[PDB]
Design an enzyme around this catalytic site. Structure first.
Site, PDB file in Angstrom:
ATOM      1  CG  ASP A 146      -1.983   1.045   1.144  1.00 46.47           C
ATOM      2  OD1 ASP A 146      -2.829   0.966   0.230  1.00 46.47           O
ATOM      3  OD2 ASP A 146      -1.976   1.955   1.997  1.00 46.47           O
ATOM      4  CD  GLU A 167      -2.477   2.045  -3.459  1.00 46.40           C
ATOM      5  OE1 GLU A 167      -2.096   1.772  -2.304  1.00 46.40           O
ATOM      6  OE2 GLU A 167      -3.633   2.441  -3.714  1.00 46.40           O
TER       7      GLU A 167
HETATM    8  O1  LIG Z   1      -2.380   4.076   3.408  1.00 42.68           O
HETATM    9  C1  LIG Z   1      -3.745   3.754   3.476  1.00 42.68           C
HETATM   10  C2  LIG Z   1      -4.421   4.263   2.227  1.00 42.68           C
HETATM   11  O2  LIG Z   1      -5.753   4.748   2.603  1.00 42.68           O
HETATM   12  C3  LIG Z   1      -6.697   3.621   2.706  1.00 42.68           C
HETATM   13  O3  LIG Z   1      -7.902   4.047   3.280  1.00 42.68           O
HETATM   14  C4  LIG Z   1      -7.695   5.142   4.257  1.00 42.68           C
HETATM   15  C5  LIG Z   1      -7.478   4.550   5.603  1.00 42.68           C
HETATM   16  O4  LIG Z   1      -6.064   4.257   5.742  1.00 42.68           O
HETATM   17  C6  LIG Z   1      -7.878   5.437   6.734  1.00 42.68           C
HETATM   18  O5  LIG Z   1      -9.135   4.947   7.264  1.00 42.68           O
HETATM   19  C7  LIG Z   1      -8.039   6.911   6.376  1.00 42.68           C
HETATM   20  O6  LIG Z   1      -8.719   7.565   7.392  1.00 42.68           O
HETATM   21  C8  LIG Z   1      -8.055   8.834   7.643  1.00 42.68           C
HETATM   22  C9  LIG Z   1      -7.183   8.665   8.825  1.00 42.68           C
HETATM   23  O7  LIG Z   1      -6.266   7.574   8.589  1.00 42.68           O
HETATM   24  C10 LIG Z   1      -6.392   9.904   9.126  1.00 42.68           C
HETATM   25  O8  LIG Z   1      -6.416  10.011  10.546  1.00 42.68           O
HETATM   26  C11 LIG Z   1      -6.982  11.145   8.411  1.00 42.68           C
HETATM   27  O9  LIG Z   1      -6.412  12.426   8.743  1.00 42.68           O
HETATM   28  C12 LIG Z   1      -6.201  12.880  10.124  1.00 42.68           C
HETATM   29  C13 LIG Z   1      -7.353  12.571  11.014  1.00 42.68           C
HETATM   30  O10 LIG Z   1      -8.322  13.658  10.893  1.00 42.68           O
HETATM   31  C14 LIG Z   1      -6.966  12.458  12.463  1.00 42.68           C
HETATM   32  O11 LIG Z   1      -6.822  11.079  12.724  1.00 42.68           O
HETATM   33  C15 LIG Z   1      -5.649  13.221  12.775  1.00 42.68           C
HETATM   34  O12 LIG Z   1      -5.325  13.346  14.132  1.00 42.68           O
HETATM   35  C16 LIG Z   1      -5.552  12.210  15.016  1.00 42.68           C
HETATM   36  C17 LIG Z   1      -4.341  11.360  15.148  1.00 42.68           C
HETATM   37  O13 LIG Z   1      -3.829  11.009  13.816  1.00 42.68           O
HETATM   38  C18 LIG Z   1      -4.632  10.109  15.884  1.00 42.68           C
HETATM   39  O14 LIG Z   1      -3.383   9.479  16.239  1.00 42.68           O
HETATM   40  C19 LIG Z   1      -5.402  10.392  17.135  1.00 42.68           C
HETATM   41  O15 LIG Z   1      -4.834   9.602  18.168  1.00 42.68           O
HETATM   42  C20 LIG Z   1      -5.788   9.151  19.210  1.00 42.68           C
HETATM   43  C21 LIG Z   1      -6.498  10.272  19.851  1.00 42.68           C
HETATM   44  O16 LIG Z   1      -5.527  11.027  20.651  1.00 42.68           O
HETATM   45  C22 LIG Z   1      -7.613   9.829  20.759  1.00 42.68           C
HETATM   46  O17 LIG Z   1      -8.793  10.414  20.284  1.00 42.68           O
HETATM   47  C23 LIG Z   1      -7.878   8.294  20.906  1.00 42.68           C
HETATM   48  O18 LIG Z   1      -9.232   8.066  21.015  1.00 42.68           O
HETATM   49  C24 LIG Z   1      -9.822   7.961  22.388  1.00 42.68           C
HETATM   50  C25 LIG Z   1      -9.111   6.972  23.259  1.00 42.68           C
HETATM   51  O19 LIG Z   1     -10.079   5.996  23.709  1.00 42.68           O
HETATM   52  C26 LIG Z   1      -8.506   7.604  24.457  1.00 42.68           C
HETATM   53  O20 LIG Z   1      -7.486   8.536  24.058  1.00 42.68           O
HETATM   54  C27 LIG Z   1      -9.588   8.336  25.255  1.00 42.68           C
HETATM   55  O21 LIG Z   1      -9.022   8.882  26.395  1.00 42.68           O
HETATM   56  O22 LIG Z   1     -10.212   9.411  24.481  1.00 42.68           O
HETATM   57  C28 LIG Z   1      -9.974   9.355  22.991  1.00 42.68           C
HETATM   58  C29 LIG Z   1     -11.140   9.992  22.322  1.00 42.68           C
HETATM   59  O23 LIG Z   1     -11.091  11.376  22.571  1.00 42.68           O
HETATM   60  O24 LIG Z   1      -7.418   7.430  19.819  1.00 42.68           O
HETATM   61  C30 LIG Z   1      -6.813   8.176  18.651  1.00 42.68           C
HETATM   62  C31 LIG Z   1      -6.190   7.260  17.726  1.00 42.68           C
HETATM   63  O25 LIG Z   1      -6.714   6.010  17.927  1.00 42.68           O
HETATM   64  O26 LIG Z   1      -5.406  11.803  17.554  1.00 42.68           O
HETATM   65  C32 LIG Z   1      -5.939  12.728  16.414  1.00 42.68           C
HETATM   66  C33 LIG Z   1      -7.395  12.819  16.508  1.00 42.68           C
HETATM   67  O27 LIG Z   1      -7.708  13.881  17.385  1.00 42.68           O
HETATM   68  O28 LIG Z   1      -4.521  12.638  12.060  1.00 42.68           O
HETATM   69  C34 LIG Z   1      -4.824  12.371  10.591  1.00 42.68           C
HETATM   70  C35 LIG Z   1      -3.795  13.047   9.811  1.00 42.68           C
HETATM   71  O29 LIG Z   1      -3.826  12.547   8.498  1.00 42.68           O
HETATM   72  O30 LIG Z   1      -8.446  11.164   8.532  1.00 42.68           O
HETATM   73  C36 LIG Z   1      -9.067   9.954   7.866  1.00 42.68           C
HETATM   74  C37 LIG Z   1      -9.612  10.394   6.557  1.00 42.68           C
HETATM   75  O31 LIG Z   1     -10.009   9.256   5.824  1.00 42.68           O
HETATM   76  O32 LIG Z   1      -8.760   7.199   5.121  1.00 42.68           O
HETATM   77  C38 LIG Z   1      -8.904   6.029   4.208  1.00 42.68           C
HETATM   78  C39 LIG Z   1      -9.063   6.557   2.814  1.00 42.68           C
HETATM   79  O33 LIG Z   1      -9.445   5.519   1.987  1.00 42.68           O
HETATM   80  C40 LIG Z   1      -6.982   3.045   1.317  1.00 42.68           C
HETATM   81  O34 LIG Z   1      -7.998   3.865   0.667  1.00 42.68           O
HETATM   82  C41 LIG Z   1      -5.789   3.011   0.451  1.00 42.68           C
HETATM   83  O35 LIG Z   1      -5.773   1.742  -0.222  1.00 42.68           O
HETATM   84  C42 LIG Z   1      -4.481   3.166   1.159  1.00 42.68           C
HETATM   85  O36 LIG Z   1      -3.470   3.458   0.163  1.00 42.68           O
HETATM   86  O1  LIG Z   2      -6.319   5.991  -6.143  1.00 45.83           O
HETATM   87  C1  LIG Z   2      -6.158   5.876  -4.724  1.00 45.83           C
HETATM   88  C2  LIG Z   2      -6.309   7.245  -4.090  1.00 45.83           C
HETATM   89  O2  LIG Z   2      -6.097   7.148  -2.688  1.00 45.83           O
HETATM   90  C3  LIG Z   2      -4.710   7.064  -2.265  1.00 45.83           C
HETATM   91  O3  LIG Z   2      -4.525   6.763  -0.851  1.00 45.83           O
HETATM   92  C4  LIG Z   2      -3.726   8.100  -2.862  1.00 45.83           C
HETATM   93  O4  LIG Z   2      -3.146   8.906  -1.833  1.00 45.83           O
HETATM   94  C5  LIG Z   2      -4.440   8.992  -3.854  1.00 45.83           C
HETATM   95  O5  LIG Z   2      -3.463   9.691  -4.637  1.00 45.83           O
HETATM   96  C6  LIG Z   2      -5.322   8.171  -4.783  1.00 45.83           C
HETATM   97  O6  LIG Z   2      -6.086   9.069  -5.601  1.00 45.83           O
END
Ligand SMILES: OC[C@@H]1O[C@@H](O[C@@H]2[C@@H](O)[C@H](O)[C@H](O[C@@H]3[C@@H](O)[C@H](O)[C@H](O[C@H]4[C@H](O)[C@@H](O)[C@@H](O[C@H]5[C@H](O)[C@@H](O)[C@@H](O[C@H]6[C@H](O)[C@@H](O)[C@@H](O[C@H]7[C@H](O)[C@@H](O)[C@@H](O)O[C@@H]7CO)O[C@@H]6CO)O[C@@H]5CO)O[C@@H]4CO)O[C@H]3CO)O[C@H]2CO)[C@@H](O)[C@H](O)[C@H]1O
Ligand SMILES: OC[C@H]1O[C@H](O)[C@H](O)[C@@H](O)[C@@H]1O
Ligand SMILES: OC[C@H]1O[C@H](O[C@H]2[C@H](O)[C@@H](O)[C@@H](O[C@H]3[C@H](O)[C@@H](O)[C@@H](O)O[C@@H]3CO)O[C@@H]2CO)[C@H](O)[C@@H](O)[C@@H]1O
Ligand SMILES: OC[C@H]1O[C@H](O[C@H]2[C@H](O)[C@@H](O)[C@@H](O[C@H]3[C@H](O)[C@@H](O)[C@@H](O)O[C@@H]3CO)O[C@@H]2CO)[C@H](O)[C@@H](O)[C@@H]1O
Ligand SMILES: OC[C@H]1O[C@H](O)[C@H](O)[C@@H](O)[C@@H]1O
Ligand SMILES: OC[C@H]1O[C@H](O)[C@H](O)[C@@H](O)[C@@H]1O
Ligand SMILES: OC[C@H]1O[C@H](O)[C@H](O)[C@@H](O)[C@@H]1O
Ligand SMILES: OC[C@H]1O[C@H](O)[C@H](O)[C@@H](O)[C@@H]1O
Ligand SMILES: OC[C@H]1O[C@H](O)[C@H](O)[C@@H](O)[C@@H]1O
Ligand SMILES: OC[C@H]1O[C@H](O)[C@H](O)[C@@H](O)[C@@H]1O
Lengths: 729, 712
Positions: free
Chosen positions: B347, B398
């Site tokens: 990925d 990918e």
């Molecule tokens: O490579 C993969 C690629 O994409 C695939 O599909 C995608 C898939 O990978 C994902 O689902 C993706 O979703 C994304 C997120 O991955 C990503 O986060 C993204 O952007 C933001 C996002 O808005 C926030 O997550 C942001 O900040 C958060 C931190 O990253 C995170 O670590 C979080 O940490 C913890 C948090 O402190 C806390 O809330 C905790 O939760 C509770 C606990 O129980 C405990 O702490 C309790 O006391 O209270 C809390 C609740 O309050 O847990 C958290 C983590 O578990 O802190 C921040 C949140 O405040 O970071 C990222 C920055 O990017 O948002 C989504 C958007 O989608 O998207 C998919 C897309 O498809 C495949 O499509 C593909 O094949 C592949 O290539």
């Molecule tokens: O095609 C897969 C899509 O999601 C992916 O996570 C890539 O970041 C983005 O460039 C692409 O358009």
């Protein structure tokens, strides 16, 4: 005790073949499950013979089956068969092959590479070969010439990716093994073998099937000496003690035991690190710098002449050194091997897979096989070798000979990001071992002067130090060069520190100390040597006095500069090379000279200099360069030296002992001029007077005083070709 | 002399390799790399104690005897297989400098083979805690799985048809009628359906350990797909019916069982691995395994300690650091040798080309290429390609990431790596929907994309052709919706590809006229025919064989309901499309000239238009036809009419021969594909014989045909 093989057929089915050894023959149970594709029953045409052993309903008719038996005492073989339904049609594997199974040998495992012993007792063999498409294992028993047993490996069962592998119930009655690759009947040495046999030139060696007994290290601990507090002494295991004058029994001289027997001699000089020349097995013709193998020591260095005895003796030597507080450093050649392009020279990996382990056609002007150091397979081999030499033999560091070569990529280019050096630097196991880059190359191709990467971790051997010091004592260099080299060669080690500069004035190759002052002709101009007025040994008293002064000056500059002094074998006792610049002409160390007054002077002076370095650790054993406020440069009489004046071969250092317990200043005068010169001593506070500790123009009783007193602002008379050291008190 | 378990167990020094817990000499050897840790201790739990989040035993580690280099290690005699283990590291806490050491945290070993936190999918811990304490499984001194003689299939990659499948969704619906819905065992009872569908390779969506409740505490969302991995050596224990039984060992075995069964039915397994980031997120995320051990080593960091975000998921794995390189290669080798996996799909593999900060001239040379710069020969991909074991498995990439790097056709390959051909997807989506200027590109796609892979030394089967995947529109949604409908994701419809290159075939939505529905059926069959006649490896996602619909949602990563499930009840309703797809796959298998090992040559492949030998390559063209010599079929003529107009296309003149219809996507089922199982096949052919005798075929708009040259 059974092994299953599940062949996928070409008519959407499965065929399970279970091979079970008998408590002596073998039982092969073939089972066809499923239905439809075999509607009407089928027969097991074993090699298409008039037999065929029709399969009968074995389990509820769903599982058809047959059972075959094979006689005992039969060597490992292959049962190949087809299945024919009740219409004449044949049934084959999904690769359009006849179902073939091994009998007498199990499938094996792809890891660990080499030979392994499993919990049951079965011996696993694994070897990597991408070029080969046919591999076989030869097992030789006690004498053999031809294999006592040959086991061909099925490319489909005995292979995971590019790792051929095979397991054996036991190897009783067998003492060694080898690999045949491609189809050429020449046995090959397993790269990952930890124990090997004796070389035999076509070339031939066999990995031993014996496992090195567990070695009891006891309370052995790594000295872990700081790099700054290091005084190295390079030694050749053979030449160090093989001479009868060493006073060791035969078969103990020239070995690791002989090396450990002289730990008192090593301690007498203040040495705390011995830098052994390559100990890897090597072709007797080419020498230690062309290794065949990378996982064991050379058997010539063992008392019994065997590899197991070699392992034990080297571990004993390392134990003795460690318990005596002396580190062990191994010179390792990982840039080439002794194997040749032809098939007669091939022994270990030029045969197994030479497209991976070696560069295409090597390099220009060099027959020696150049390793593909940055190919991942070779990277893994070298890293496993280093980890074996650290975790197994408790080695403290490595001096990589021909280190620049390691930066070159597969095509002979220079890599901006050499992966192998990066892997070595950041290997978790090796993080605490010393790594030293040695630009000198046993080959005949000088590579380039370039910025070897270090990550603030690699030390380097400073050949520039040797050249500059030799030239200054020869009166063909600016005093600025000596100033640069005395202060730790900061131009090269600015971001590392003086300790990362391994200074030296004489090497295993080139001219020795007594040869830098006696042999100076047209061919030796590259050595920057001076004959002191008469080529070769002479009786002219003035010439001999000048030569003694020059030797003293060389040692003095070596031990007063900032860095790690590296003392070559025999330099302490005038081991003359007879005017030859080839390391192959070096001979056994003549220990008798240790009772002479000349060697007495040399060893005492070296010991005094090392004691001075130890005591005044705030000056010489520093991790950082001296501040540019506690160093001053002076000439004849407390004046600006002629830095750009080539004719001025005199210079003076004044070091202010930074008292951050009191410390005494230092004043060092270097005079390579053919004529004397005055020296105005610096000014000292009331009650402090200079102590003349070193003066290279005097006899032994007074040459190095532990003392003469001189008032401040005095005027000493430095004789020609001498070094003087004073210390304020 | 020291003892661990109340005096029963003995504690020795151990050895630094191999990393992770290893059964050895009547005990267990633990080894873990940590450079920044000043102190470390090993924490042992019993399952009930871990449920209570309490350490049953704690063995401190002496930095003198239990540390070789940067590897802490300790050996413990005894029967520890029934306990779980973690580490407690003490160092410097300095987020600005990239350090996160804190003794109050117990972290899971990166090399742990099973991470025991929770047992049931979607059930929080004791008190709604979605992030309860996690531990690692301690191995037994023996393996407890019978592979039954399993051997690697090693199917040539040109002979692969790949079926991307979600392990849980494949059988979680109530209509699956399996003993354990949504598990490995539950999926084992449908590999027969997969085999009859024509598939011989299954690309599992991420089955590495991950937390499905990471989006649940805040918001109320799930992590269905699992693209945020906790542990890389560990399978998902919530995808097994065993759960946390026998400290996860059962779960391990279950995965193995699935693989075994797949190989008993002639199906290779390709694991979808996500090495470009971790579930720990940015500085604000939880500290589970890597951040508490060595954050500065395992993650890409700007100089000020901020986390580089090229994956788009919070952090970026330092793939090209030497330690991380060794870890990743070891993980892949473990999945190939221990779990008998046949290949991997990486990925956002382009993140594995970006260099690490170790080569910044500040670190090397001490003073003045930088972090995150794509490399020509990345060390990690070099190590994977030329690995003794991994070199001979499938390596699909990918080739892109969320940082703007796009490397289709250029991924450092060593003539080994395959790629997800996104250009094929775009070109086929645009041609089959009636777009100008895609006849030449479509023809190139049909030939294995020689303009991308031939120059570099790769073959047509290094191109993984696909029209739909898990991310993006399904095949049915690709012909039903013009734009995404992601309001259910919660992020104000900001998710997923905005340039879908889709067409609703007239009216939008599932409620359209009869003509639109028939056109959609035609388009689905046309996409499948184009996929199954192209050179390369045809890959399609699960459900596309019967017309799975996600309601226009092209990003369903956070939905644990039927929108992502295989609908076995809806498969029977649309069994006509499933029959057509199965027959197309079988037809590809039979043809000798479709799964070619080399790019088609002009000797075998001839291009036609509405008239033989006169293809139209202009920008206005919307028709692509060719004829291919076949060693089993004699000759096959394929034609695609993406224009909105019907056409009577003339066929090549072969004296003494006739063209016999095989496939026509416009025909009503079962006549869309003619087989001998139809009693009236001969009558159907005779009813068009008057067109086929004059070398003609009448084609509807947006339709494709396949004919075979029979002697006559
Ligand atoms: O490579 C993969 C690629 O994409 C695939 O599909 C995608 C898939 O990978 C994902 O689902 C993706 O979703 C994304 C997120 O991955 C990503 O986060 C993204 O952007 C933001 C996002 O808005 C926030 O997550 C942001 O900040 C958060 C931190 O990253 C995170 O670590 C979080 O940490 C913890 C948090 O402190 C806390 O809330 C905790 O939760 C509770 C606990 O129980 C405990 O702490 C309790 O006391 O209270 C809390 C609740 O309050 O847990 C958290 C983590 O578990 O802190 C921040 C949140 O405040 O970071 C990222 C920055 O990017 O948002 C989504 C958007 O989608 O998207 C998919 C897309 O498809 C495949 O499509 C593909 O094949 C592949 O290539
Ligand atoms: O095609 C897969 C899509 O999601 C992916 O996570 C890539 O970041 C983005 O460039 C692409 O358009
Ligand atoms: O393309 C113009 C051409 O064909 C017209 O018929 C259909 C097109 O062939 C077809 O591509 C489609 O156009 C859609 C695009 O494919 C897609 O980007 C989409 O999201 O929007 C477009 C439609 O809204 O649909 C048209 C018909 O609606 C047309 O019949 C011909 O007269 C014309 O020459
Ligand atoms: O016949 C073997 C041949 O097939 C393929 O070549 C075809 C291309 O796939 C196809 O795009 C088309 O190329 C033409 C352009 O579309 C058009 O713009 C114009 O400028 O001429 C091009 C060729 O004359 O047609 C060719 C075949 O004519 C495949 O790519 C080749 O590798 C293969 O040799
Ligand atoms: O190597 C020494 C040279 O550089 C120095 O910084 C000083 O100016 C002087 O000592 C000389 O010019
Ligand atoms: O001090 C003598 C010389 O030594 C060094 O090489 C530095 O350039 C500076 O310290 C000076 O020029
Ligand atoms: O790299 C630093 C160089 O110049 C400095 O001022 C140091 O005093 C000297 O040890 C060195 O020659
Ligand atoms: O050690 C004293 C140091 O001070 C200087 O400003 C530089 O760092 C170096 O040239 C010198 O060696
Ligand atoms: O960055 C441009 C590319 O990014 C993505 O990886 C998309 O999959 C592709 O459709 C797009 O053209
Ligand atoms: O905004 C979050 C986005 O990140 C990624 O690049 C994905 O391609 C996209 O589907 C997702 O919605």
């Amino acid at each position: 005790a059974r092994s299953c093989y599940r062949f996928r057929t070409d008519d959407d089915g499965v065929v399970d073949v279970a091979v079970s050894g008998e408590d002596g023959g073998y039982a092969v149970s073939v089972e066809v499950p499923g239905t439809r594709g075999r509607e009407g029953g089928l027969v097991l045409r074993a090699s298409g013979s008039g037999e065929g052993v029709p399969l009968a309903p074995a389990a509820g008719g769903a599982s058809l089956a047959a059972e075959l038996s094979f006689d005992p005492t039969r060597a490992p073989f292959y049962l190949s068969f087809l299945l024919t339904d009740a219409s004449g049609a044949e049934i084959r594997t999904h690769r359009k092959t006849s179902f073939r199974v091994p009998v007498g040998v199990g499938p094996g495992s792809p890891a660990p590479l080499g030979m392994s012993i499993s919990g049951d007792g079965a011996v696993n063999f694994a070897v990597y070969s991408k070029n080969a498409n046919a591999v076989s294992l030869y097992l030789y028993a006690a004498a053999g010439d031809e294999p006592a047993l040959e086991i061909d490996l099925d490319p489909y069962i005995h292979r995971t990716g590019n790792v051929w592998h095979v397991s054996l119930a036991s190897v009783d009655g067998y003492v060694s093994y080898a690999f045949c690759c491609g189809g050429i009947r020449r046995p090959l040495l397993d790269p990952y073998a930890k124990v090997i046999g004796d070389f035999v030139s076509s070339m031939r060696c066999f990995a031993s099937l014996a496992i090195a007994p567990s070695y009891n290290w006891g309370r052995d601990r790594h000295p872990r000496l700081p790099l700054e507090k290091l005084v190295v002494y390079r030694a050749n295991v053979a030449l160090f003690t093989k001479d009868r004058s060493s006073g060791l029994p035969d078969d103990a001289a020239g070995t690791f035991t002989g090396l450990s027997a002289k730990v008192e001699h090593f301690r007498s000089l203040g040495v705390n690190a011995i830098l052994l020349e390559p100990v890897f097995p090597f072709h007797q013709v080419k020498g230690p710098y062309f290794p065949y193998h990378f996982f064991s020591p050379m058997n010539l260095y063992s008392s019994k002449g065997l590899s197991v005895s070699a392992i034990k003796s080297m571990k004993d030597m390392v134990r003795v050194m460690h318990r005596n507080g002396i580190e062990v450093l191994l010179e390792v050649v990982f840039t080439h091997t002794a194997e040749g392009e032809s098939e007669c020279q091939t022994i270990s990996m030029r045969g197994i897979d030479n497209s991976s382990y070696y560069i295409a056609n090597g390099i220009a002007g060099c027959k020696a096989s150049i390793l593909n150091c940055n190919h991942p397979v070779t990277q893994k081999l070298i890293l496993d070798s280093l980890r074996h030499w650290v975790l197994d033999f408790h080695v403290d560091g490595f001096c990589f000979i021909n280190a620049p070569f390691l930066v070159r990529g597969p095509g002979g280019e220079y890599l901006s990001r050499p992966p192998l050096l990066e892997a070595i630097t950041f290997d978790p196991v090796l993080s605490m071992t010393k790594i030293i880059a040695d630009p000198w190359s046993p080959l005949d191709i000088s590579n380039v002067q370039f910025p070897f990467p270090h990550w603030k971790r690699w030390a380097e051997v400073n050949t520039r130090f040797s050249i500059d010091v030799r030239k200054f004592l020869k009166r063909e260099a600016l005093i600025s060069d000596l100033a640069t080299r005395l202060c730790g060669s900061g131009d090269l080690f600015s971001t590392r520190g003086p300790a990362f500069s391994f200074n030296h004035v004489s090497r295993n190759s080139g001219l020795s100390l007594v040869d830098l002052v006696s042999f100076s002709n047209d061919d030796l101009l590259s050595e920057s040597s001076w004959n002191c007025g008469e080529e070769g040994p002479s009786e002219n008293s003035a010439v001999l006095q000048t030569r003694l002064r020059q030797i003293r000056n060389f040692l003095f500059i070596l031990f007063v500069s900032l860095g790690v002094p590296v003392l070559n074998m025999g330099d302490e006792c005038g081991h003359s090379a007879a005017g030859s610049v080839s390391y192959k002409d070096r001979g056994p160390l003549n220990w008798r000279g240790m009772k002479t007054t000349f060697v007495k002077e040399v060893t005492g002076f070296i010991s005094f200099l090392t004691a001075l370095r130890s005591r005044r650790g705030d000056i010489f054993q520093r991790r950082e360069f001296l501040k540019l406020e506690n160093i001053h440069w002076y000439g004849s009489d407390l004046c600006e030296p002629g830095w750009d004046d080539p004719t001025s071969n005199f210079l003076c250092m004044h070091i202010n002992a930074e008292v951050d317990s009191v410390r005494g200043d230092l004043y060092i005068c270097f005079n390579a001029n053919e004529e004397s010169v005055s020296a105005a001593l610096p000014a000292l506070a009331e009650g402090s007077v200079w102590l003349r500790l070193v003066d290279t123009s005097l006899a032994f009783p007074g040459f190095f005083a532990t003392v003469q007193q001189v008032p401040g602002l005095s005027s000493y008379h430095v004789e020609a070709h001498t070094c003087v050291l004073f210390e304020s008190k | 002399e020291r003892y661990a378990l109340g005096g029963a167990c003995r504690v020795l020094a151990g050895m630094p390799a191999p990393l992770g817990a290893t059964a050895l000499d009547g005990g267990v050897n633990f080894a873990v790399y940590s450079a920044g840790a000043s102190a470390a201790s090993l924490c042992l739990f019993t399952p009930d104690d871990l449920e209570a989040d309490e350490v049953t035993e704690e063995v401190p580690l002496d930095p003198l005897f239990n540390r070789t280099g940067n590897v802490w290690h300790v050996f413990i005699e005894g029967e520890l297989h029934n306990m779980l283990y973690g580490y407690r590291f003490d160092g410097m806490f300095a987020p600005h400098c990239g350090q996160y050491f804190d003794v109050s945290n117990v972290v899971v070993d990166p090399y742990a083979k099973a991470v025991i936190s929770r047992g049931e999918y979607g059930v929080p811990g004791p008190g709604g805690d979605c992030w309860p304490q996690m531990a690692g499984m301690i191995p037994l001194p023996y393996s407890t799985f019978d592979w039954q003689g399993d051997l690697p299939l090693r199917y040539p990659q040109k002979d692969l048809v790949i079926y991307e499948m979600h392990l849980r969704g494949f059988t979680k619906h109530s209509s699956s009628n399996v003993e354990h819905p949504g598990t490995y065992i539950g999926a084992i009872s449908k590999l027969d359906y997969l085999k009859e569908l024509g598939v011989n390779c299954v690309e599992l969506m991420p089955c590495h350990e991950f937390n499905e409740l990471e989006y649940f505490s805040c918001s109320s969302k799930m992590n269905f797909w699992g693209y945020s991995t906790i542990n890389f050596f560990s399978p998902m224990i919530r995808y097994s019916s065993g759960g946390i039984r026998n400290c996860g060992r059962d779960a391990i075995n279950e995965f193995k069982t699935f693989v075994r069964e797949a190989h008993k039915r002639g199906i290779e397994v390709i694991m979808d691995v996500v090495f470009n980031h971790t579930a720990e997120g940015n500085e604000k995320g939880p500290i589970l395994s890597f951040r508490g051990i060595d954050n500065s080593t395992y993650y890409m960091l700007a100089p000020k300690g901020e986390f580089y975000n090229y994956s788009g998921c919070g952090n970026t794995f330092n793939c090209n650091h030497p330690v991380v390189r060794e870890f990743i290669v070891d993980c892949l080798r473990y999945w190939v040798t221990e779990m008998h996996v046949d290949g991997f799909r990486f990925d956002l593999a382009s993140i594995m080309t970006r260099g690490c900060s170790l080569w910044d001239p500040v670190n090397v040379y001490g003073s003045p290429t930088t972090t995150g710069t794509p490399l020509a020969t990345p060390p990690l991909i070099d190590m994977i390609s030329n690995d003794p074991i991994l070199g001979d498995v499938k390596l699909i990439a990918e080739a892109w990431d969320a940082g703007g790097l796009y490397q289709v056709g250029q991924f450092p390959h060593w003539k080994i790596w395959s790629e997800w051909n996104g250009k094929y997807r775009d070109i086929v989506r645009q041609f089959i929907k009636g777009t100008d200027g895609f006849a030449g590109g479509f023809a190139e796609c049909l030939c294995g994309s020689p303009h991308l892979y031939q120059a570099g030394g790769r073959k047509p089967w290094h191109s993984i052709n696909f029209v739909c995947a898990h991310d993006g529109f399904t095949l049915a949604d690709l012909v039903t919706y013009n734009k995404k409908y992601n309001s259910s994701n919660g992020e104000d419809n900001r998710d997923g590809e905005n340039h879908n290159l889709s067409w609703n075939c007239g009216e939008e939505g599932e409620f359209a006229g009869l003509s639109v529905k028939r056109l959609r059926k035609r388009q689905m069959r046309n996409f499948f025919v184009s996929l199954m006649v192209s050179q390369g490896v045809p890959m399609f996602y699960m459900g596309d064989e019967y017309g799975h619909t996600k309601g226009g949602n092209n990003n369903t990563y956070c939905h644990d309901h039927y929108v992502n499930y295989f609908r076995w009840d809806k498969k029977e309703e649309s069994s006509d499309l499933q029959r057509f797809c199965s027959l197309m796959t079988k037809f590809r298998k039979q043809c000798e000239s479709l799964g070619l090992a080399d790019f088609p040559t002009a000797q075998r492949l001839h291009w036609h238009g509405h008239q033989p030998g006169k293809p139209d390559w202009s920008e206005t063209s919307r028709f692509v036809a060719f004829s291919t010599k076949d060693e089993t079929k004699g000759e096959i003529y394929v034609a695609f009419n993406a224009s909105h107009l019907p056409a009577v296309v003339g066929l090549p003149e072969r004296p003494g021969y006739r063209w016999e219809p095989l496939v026509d996507t416009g025909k009503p089922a079962p006549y869309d594909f003619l087989t001998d199982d139809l009693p009236d096949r001969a009558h159907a052919v005779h009813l068009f014989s008057h067109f086929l005798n004059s070398n003609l075929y009448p084609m509807l708009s947006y339709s494709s045909i396949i004919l075979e040259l029979q002697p006559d």
